[PDB]
Amino acid sequence: KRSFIEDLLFNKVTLLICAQKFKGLTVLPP
Amino acid sequence: GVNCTEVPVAIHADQLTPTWRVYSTGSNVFQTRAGCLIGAEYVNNSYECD
Ligand SMILES: *[C@@H]1O[C@H](CO)[C@@H](O)[C@H](O)[C@H]1NC(C)=O
Numbered sequence: 754k755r756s757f758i759e760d761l762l763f764n765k766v767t768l769l770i771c772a773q774k775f776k777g778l779t780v781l782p783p
Numbered sequence: 784g785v786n787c788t789e790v791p792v793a794i795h796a797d798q799l800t801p802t803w804r805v806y807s808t809g810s811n812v813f814q815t816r817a818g819c820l821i822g823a824e825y826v827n828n829s830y831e832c833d
């Protein structure tokens with residue numbers, strides 16, 4: 754449930770390296 | 784951050800760093816996006832977060 758401008762904002766900004774991080778480095782979810 | 788098919792295989796003697804393996808065979812197991820919860824049942828109503 755998003756509008757047009759929200760869809761554009763989500764598409765424009767983009768976020769194996771995470772798999773490579775076996776060295777005790779994790780990212781928690783919000 | 785562990786798929787919850789690892790802790791049931793972890794149910795053994797001297798096959799896990801934490802000692803309290805007895806609690807692995809505990810209560811209803813729930814799947815979340817940050818791991819899996821052991822010992823808490825999942826109702827499907829809504830409240831204010833505690
Ligand atoms: C664990 O992996 C299996 C792959 O067979 C998948 O079906 C399941 O949804 C996953 N569960 C969790 C909690 O990651």
Ligand SMILES: *[C@@H]1O[C@H](CO)[C@@H](O)[C@H](O)[C@H]1NC(C)=O
Pocket residue numbers: 827
């Ligand atoms: C909530 O969980 C109960 C468990 O038996 C189920 O019967 C019911 O249909 C569920 N309600 C919804 C809205 O998923």
